[PDB]
Amino acid sequence: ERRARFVSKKGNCNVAHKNIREQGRFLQDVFTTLVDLKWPHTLLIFTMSFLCSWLLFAMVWWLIAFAHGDLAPGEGTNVPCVTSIHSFSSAFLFSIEVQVTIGFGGRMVTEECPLAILILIVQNIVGLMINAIMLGCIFMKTAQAHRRAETLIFSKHAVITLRHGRLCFMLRVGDLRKSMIISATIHMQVVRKTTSPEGEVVPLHQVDIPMENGVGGNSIFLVAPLIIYHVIDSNSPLYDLAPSDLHHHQDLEIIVILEGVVETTGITTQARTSYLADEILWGQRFVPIVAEEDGRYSVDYSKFGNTVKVPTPLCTARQLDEDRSLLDALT
Amino acid sequence: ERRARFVSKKGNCNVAHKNIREQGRFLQDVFTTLVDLKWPHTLLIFTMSFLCSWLLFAMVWWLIAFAHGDLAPGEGTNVPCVTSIHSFSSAFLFSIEVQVTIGFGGRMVTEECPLAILILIVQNIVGLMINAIMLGCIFMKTAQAHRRAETLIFSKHAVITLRHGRLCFMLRVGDLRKSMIISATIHMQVVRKTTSPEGEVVPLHQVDIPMENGVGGNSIFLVAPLIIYHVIDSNSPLYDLAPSDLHHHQDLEIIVILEGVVETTGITTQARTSYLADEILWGQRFVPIVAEEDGRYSVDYSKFGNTVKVPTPLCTARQLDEDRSLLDALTL
Amino acid sequence: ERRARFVSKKGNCNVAHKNIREQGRFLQDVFTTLVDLKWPHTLLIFTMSFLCSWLLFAMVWWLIAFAHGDLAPGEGTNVPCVTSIHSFSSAFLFSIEVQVTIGFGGRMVTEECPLAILILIVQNIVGLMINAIMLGCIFMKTAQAHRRAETLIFSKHAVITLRHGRLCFMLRVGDLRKSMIISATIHMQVVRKTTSPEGEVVPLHQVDIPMENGVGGNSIFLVAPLIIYHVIDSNSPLYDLAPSDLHHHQDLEIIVILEGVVETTGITTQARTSYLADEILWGQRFVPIVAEEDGRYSVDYSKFGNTVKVPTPLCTARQLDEDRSLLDAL
Ligand SMILES: CCCCCCCCCCCCCCCCCC(=O)OC[C@H](COP(=O)(O)OC[C@H](N)C(=O)O)OC(=O)CCCCCCCCCCCCCCCCC
Ligand SMILES: CCCCCCCCCCCCCCCCCC(=O)OC[C@H](COP(=O)(O)OC[C@H](N)C(=O)O)OC(=O)CCCCCCCCCCCCCCCCC
Ligand SMILES: CCCCCCCCCCCCCCCCCC(=O)OC[C@H](COP(=O)(O)OC[C@H](N)C(=O)O)OC(=O)CCCCCCCCCCCCCCCCC
Ligand SMILES: Nc1ncnc2c1ncn2[C@@H]1O[C@H](COP(=O)(O)OP(=O)(O)OP(=O)(O)O)[C@@H](O)[C@H]1O
Ligand SMILES: Nc1ncnc2c1ncn2[C@@H]1O[C@H](COP(=O)(O)OP(=O)(O)OP(=O)(O)O)[C@@H](O)[C@H]1O
Ligand SMILES: Nc1ncnc2c1ncn2[C@@H]1O[C@H](COP(=O)(O)OP(=O)(O)OP(=O)(O)O)[C@@H](O)[C@H]1O
Ligand SMILES: [K+]
Structure with missing residues (x-):
């Protein structure tokens, strides 16, 4: 009908x-x-x-x-x-x-x-x-431990804002239980009907996406909610996403796969969520959440997914990196 | 006169x-x-x-x-x-x-x-x-989970074809259950009798093969059937293969290992398959399978292993790269 | 012979x-x-x-x-x-x-x-x-799943030999059962004493060693007895070894760890072995062990750890790089 989702927001897929x-x-x-x-x-x-x-x-x-x-x-x-x-x-x-x-x-x-x-x-x-x-x-x-996957919580919709100059596709994931998830891992894929110059056609091409980690790995230590983003480098397929090109029938989907063995039963669990084309807010940084109380921290899950608006150019990543390089060379 | 396989088409490691x-x-x-x-x-x-x-x-x-x-x-x-x-x-x-x-x-x-x-x-x-x-x-x-491991499906014969400029060795993996296999990881190997210049004789040299993923890692998220294509760079031991040298009695084998833990029992599994020389259809592409229903996607498994021929330069990957560089140099 | 191994040939880490x-x-x-x-x-x-x-x-x-x-x-x-x-x-x-x-x-x-x-x-x-x-x-x-780990077999004495020009340290590993070890993983650490310029004296320093795998990973699919070989590059702490320096009275040891979950029980295992200096045979290659039966492949476990002799330069791998550079310069 309107737009089929590969995986539903609750984590269950929709492929038939x-x-x-x-x-x-x-x-x-x-x-x-x-x-x-x-x-x-x-x-x-x-x-x-x-x-x-x-x-x-x-x-x-x-x-x-x-x-x-x-x-x-x-x-x-x-x-x-x-x-x-x-x-x-x-x-x-x-x-x-x-x-x-x-x-x-x-x-x-x-x-x-x-x-x-x-x-x-x-x-x-x-x-x-x-x-x-x-x-x-x-x-x-x-x-x-599939009922443990339910306690894993993602943002209602993700954002794309500038951080450290460059542009990144941000995201937030949280855990509600007091228990820990050992050896956690956050995969991330873009699903697009990608055509190739050689003549191939792929109905849903799944492109993997780095997690922009410090050491370039998939490991994540998840206790408090984290702003798990992806640096949009030259090779990232998100390098040419125009903010004007964010409307409904834009063939896009951001899969997320949070894995990691549950400590209690010792069973590994997946968490899944898909951000659609119209479920992306350009240039809105996340609200700070981790407050500090007397001798202990405090996470405000009421403000888990709230995003405030931050100024940023409404230009494609290609129109940004190239422009910045030209300005530096001229100067 | 009996061509021996390292593993059968349903795993089933055939080594005595x-x-x-x-x-x-x-x-x-x-x-x-x-x-x-x-x-x-x-x-x-x-x-x-x-x-x-x-x-x-x-x-x-x-x-x-x-x-x-x-x-x-x-x-x-x-x-x-x-x-x-x-x-x-x-x-x-x-x-x-x-x-x-x-x-x-x-x-x-x-x-x-x-x-x-x-x-x-x-x-x-x-x-x-x-x-x-x-x-x-x-x-x-x-x-x-051996009874579950039998549900994992690999196409009968894999293909070699051009994709995004260079030449890749495609394949098709598939799952036949609503349950997910957490942390899948596809390791691919080439088995051959490769002898070093120093005189070392290795009868079955199992050389690993990258999956040509977008992040370097091997972990693949498997719900729909997927193309698993290895990009033939200048290092890959496939860099010296042509469809002329791809008859039956040719020493080759492409082992594929699909690891991953079943989400239900929490037990890690493996699926295995091989691909002889004759079972690698050169210059063919797989048919798209994921259609769209009234409101969701439609995996038409009846077209899972059908391939349609598409012409490609019938030269080796080394000859292809060398010819492309020479043509580009001549143009420039 | 007060030589104190770090681990025994069958695991059993010999540390008090x-x-x-x-x-x-x-x-x-x-x-x-x-x-x-x-x-x-x-x-x-x-x-x-x-x-x-x-x-x-x-x-x-x-x-x-x-x-x-x-x-x-x-x-x-x-x-x-x-x-x-x-x-x-x-x-x-x-x-x-x-x-x-x-x-x-x-x-x-x-x-x-x-x-x-x-x-x-x-x-x-x-x-x-x-x-x-x-x-x-x-x-x-x-x-x-430790009794199963006892059926993982390492050759008694591992070798060093030239392959593809470069110099590499080899090893033979095999399995005996009919059940695979899912997601196998071979790690290789050298135990040696480190006396850094800054005065640090680490008695048993363990530097991990790349396995020289075709993808740069540390995972291997084992059915037939493999040949595991580390290519000694300019960063490997074995880059200055010599056959003279390879006697009993040496501070060398090559811990090898073979991980991976066993398919039946679903339990992750280890197989630990070490190769002292005197337990190395410089410049010798492994016999081809995988034969071919009339119908299928074969494995001749009687010739498992047999290492034939072969000519080899009796000098440090570092000098090979210097000679190679001089050869190109000439
Ligand atoms: C074996 C019983 C023989 C007859 C004796 C009857 C007396 C019963 C009292 C004693 C029962 C013993 C209590 C044991 C406590 C175990 C708790 C337990 O197993 O989880 C409580 C269950 C779980 O429901 P869920 O979360 O929806 O299921 C998992 C999820 N849906 C999934 O797919 O993982 O939550 C429940 O389910 C409620 C549990 C109450 C059990 C009552 C059983 C009668 C069910 C009749 C159903 C008829 C219609 C079925 C239609 C189903 C359509 C989908
Ligand atoms: C006094 C006690 C008498 C017996 C009382 C019985 C009480 C029954 C209580 C409840 C029973 C519960 C049944 C469990 C249900 C699940 C069974 C199940 O999934 O497997 C079905 C099993 C056997 O399959 P498998 O060997 O694992 O299959 C191969 C591989 N795993 C695969 O599936 O892919 O199959 C079965 O559940 C049973 C099959 C029986 C077949 C017997 C055959 C004779 C044995 C010898 C055969 C070979 C002979 C020589 C042949 C040579 C050929 C060269
Ligand atoms: C008052 C009521 C008494 C009831 C007595 C009968 C009880 C019957 C029990 C029936 C079920 C038995 C279960 C055994 C099945 C599996 C056995 C098996 O695979 O291992 C056989 C074992 C030897 O293994 P281990 O190295 O000690 O431990 C295994 C491993 N290391 C681990 O961690 O698991 O070795 C064994 O289990 C075999 C032992 C045979 C004993 C025969 C007697 C003479 C020899 C005595 C042996 C030396 C005893 C020394 C005692 C020293 C005490 C400090
Ligand atoms: N619709 C399907 N449902 C389930 N499994 C399928 C389906 N189509 C193919 N397969 C599986 O894929 C593999 C071969 O696929 P392919 O369609 O390329 O060949 P095939 O002619 O169906 O093979 P075979 O003769 O082995 O059955 C086999 O393991 C087969 O069971
Ligand atoms: N011998 C030991 N056995 C077990 N745990 C020890 C031992 N020595 C230290 N630890 C552990 O090291 C940690 C630090 O302990 P602490 O700093 O109080 O002692 P320490 O390092 O032994 O002290 P010191 O400087 O007096 O030698 C603790 O978690 C303690 O359990
Ligand atoms: N045919 C075989 N089957 C099973 N295990 C074997 C076989 N041959 C050797 N092994 C194992 O390999 C190891 C010994 O290897 P190796 O042949 O190099 O030594 P060895 O037989 O003790 O030597 P030697 O008898 O010449 O001194 C042991 O762990 C042994 O169990
Ligand atoms: K009773």
Whole structure:
């Protein structure tokens, strides 16, 4: 419609796949699919797995008792293989007791028939296997940290202002939790339908972008909010963005990828956000945020994304660097 | 007469081994081995471990009951140490009830013989220890991602074509799941028999290859299918290749390694693929795939690996660069 | 031979620490300690933890039964609180049944004395917590990936030889299992004594060394046994080595670190090795180890660390640059 976003502001992407030759890999990764599922759906499969297993073996216990004929009334002329089985519902309760390992012991397993002994072995092994598998799935779900990515907070929209003479595309990212993100990393990409002289056409060319770090690396130590900018050098594809060329249907998008292993669970998480063409404010520096109180600092997240207007030329970066060079040479 | 591949098209590293002076690498690390196995083998060992423990302690319970003298039909002052034991079947079922902790209670342990108490303690500790170990293997087997690694897709044959002036070696990677692979990192290698002037003989010299990314680094953000093109500079070992020297029996291979951690299980993975000489379609470009739907993008995977020919100067990268410099000098 | 290596050929950093203010942080972190310990030590602590809990609550159950008096040899006149408690052994077996959750049911808990219900709650919670903790520690001890790191193989004695004219220090590294090591990473640090002009005397100075990789990175894909070689440039602290200076009584050592997560367990590992001066063979090359089977490639691990001899200039690499410049000038 108006303009498709590659990744939504909340971090979820919007790309739609089509014409996939389903090889069953979606079904093949049973354990991975369970982890992805929501907790209500996980609990439904959890309940259905146990209930189906309990009911399946309950029918088997009823079947073996019916075949042995020990459920019909008897007077001392018989010894049932599973004691006190005089109804199907008794077999159902017996199945619960075995697999859950409750073992009330009112419905025992006698030494008489060997088939019930084999079925008891099978039910115990199957119960342990399913318990172990559900543990694994629950342990991977309780170790999920995608809900940690939500606590990572970016500015509502980014700016482009002059700093140290040159021009840079600024940005702010914040963390709300008290915990730390070990080995953090901020990638940054521009997504443009970039045409090439040789004749190629790319529907969405993803150009990587440096983080303008001190040592030219991707490492970032994120405790307070930081003005994470990108120096618009000659090679930067943002070198030719006219401020007059900032309107809606300008084919632009600034991906941001904040990575880093969460300290608590030890799981790595991504944070994503895309700045559109009309979501950029030219020449507006960010409001200072990190105040100081008595013996301690103070971050004012109320002013997290407020930007004040600062004067700057309304010229493309090419029209700025070239002009400055000519003036210096003439002088 | 059999052209050997260093890795198969689905990873599957096809390199054998010989003369291994093993010191029990199978042994003293059995936990990694159990993770390696399939589920049929895991189930068999799962059942075998429990059945061996159950049957072993069952014999012990039977033996101690017979030692106390309770199997024989004596109703006078027998006071059996393990109640209601009257065969091996009762002993085996009792061993089930202890180690599995079912505890039916029709076969109890009384205070008579303290040796039964010691055996009960041993079986409980062994049963808990084995349950703990088997749980751990299950956790490490449910957090596997080889079944996810198979979802990553690389085109059947990569192309060489001009892009932005120079010559590059394109490719196409793809993901087939809604989940993301955090911190992807594509390392590319050229495998060849390259011998140094000094006489060194290296049969498979794995030379690394830059990804020609915009920031030098390798980390690539993979949602849509992407072109992974290596720009053939004057240093790249591809700088001396022409489509005339690109028949089948030509010693080349382009290993591609797609690293990255799955966001769900938090386990790092790898996807691998190779490209022989014949499987590098010279002078062709990939078809654009990302269309636009009513309100979002449309990756038409049916056109994932189709290429359309576009003519290019059929010369080596060294000849191309030399000819361009000579033509520019003549013009200037 | 008082030579003191920095690390052994199989890791095991041979450095003794002394005068440590051990303020309990070793003992405060119990779970990490329990992971480090061997299996015989773990089993002893495993058994002792459970047995201490069993005996402790056995005393508690026996004590409350005595206090209620329901263990008196007289049978009737009342109804007991915890049934079938006759001797201490009954109380201990009852403790087993509760904490292990076997629950035979011949020794139940009735409504008589409320303190039994409270003690039952305490024992159940404590038993579950101890079981949960031991499960976690066992799980961490099953994802140990140092035994796998013991199957990473480094050649016993590494070499220095001329390749592409320049002079480089080589090394052979290999894997034995069928499982890859994802995101491998080779670091190489020289341990030497540094006496800077400003008077600094660093006893064990570690200068990192570039691996001379085709992309300038420090990552390599290892399936077949690789050849790792550092190209000795004008900035490498090996730029002034000579075959004379390469005997036993030398302050040289080349620590090599092979990192990377193992694919199965998902655990990051290291493989540490060192090459003393006398453990180097100047001017010798590695035998081609990768053969070709009729159908696929081959690896001849019998000729792993075999180094043939080859002619080589017996002079420092610095002099090679000076001679090279003089040759061009001539
Ligand atoms: C296994 C139950 C058997 C029947 C017994 C019923 C009695 C239930 C009480 C005891 C339940 C045990 C409590 C355990 C506490 C665990 C907490 C937990 O797992 O997270 C609480 C959950 C999480 O929701 P979420 O954040 O939206 O999910 C993750 C996210 N959406 C994602 O995609 O990662 O938040 C919830 O979800 C609420 C949890 C309450 C559980 C109630 C389960 C019944 C669900 C019925 C749903 C029917 C309709 C489903 C439609 C879903 C459409 C999407
Ligand atoms: C008394 C106890 C009896 C048994 C009780 C069973 C109780 C069941 C309880 C619940 C079961 C839970 C099932 C788990 C669901 C997920 C399973 C799953 O994802 O994998 C399915 C597994 C096996 O796949 P894989 O080997 O890992 O696949 C290869 C590779 N990883 C890939 O996927 O890409 O496949 C399975 O889940 C099972 C498949 C069984 C197949 C048995 C085959 C016989 C074994 C020997 C075969 C080879 C023989 C020789 C052949 C030579 C050929 C040259
Ligand atoms: C009161 C109730 C008692 C109950 C007793 C039975 C308990 C049964 C438990 C069943 C499960 C056992 C789990 C073992 C499975 C894996 C074993 C394995 O892979 O390693 C086998 C181990 C040897 O490894 P390590 O170097 O000590 O530790 C591993 C590594 N270094 C790590 O960090 O993980 O070595 C072993 O685990 C094997 C030990 C065999 C013991 C045989 C007895 C005679 C030899 C005794 C050996 C020396 C003992 C010295 C004691 C000194 C104490 C200070
Ligand atoms: N075929 C092989 N399989 C597995 N590991 C091997 C093999 N050959 C050597 N190794 C490993 O390589 C190392 C020893 O390498 P190297 O062959 O140079 O020494 P060596 O056999 O001890 O020497 P030598 O016996 O000639 O004194 C050890 O870690 C050893 O386990
Ligand atoms: N629509 C698709 N959905 C899923 N996987 C696809 C799809 N198209 C191609 N692939 C995968 O891409 C690889 C080859 O792509 P390409 O289309 O270039 O060749 P192909 O003729 O489909 O290959 P093959 O004969 O191996 O199936 C294979 O791993 C294949 O499974
Ligand atoms: N032997 C030691 N063992 C453990 N930690 C130590 C040791 N010596 C110093 N530290 C650590 O060094 C840090 C600085 O401690 P502090 O400056 O008070 O002592 P110091 O450096 O040993 O003093 P001094 O100058 O008297 O030798 C603290 O974090 C302390 O724990
Ligand atoms: K029980």
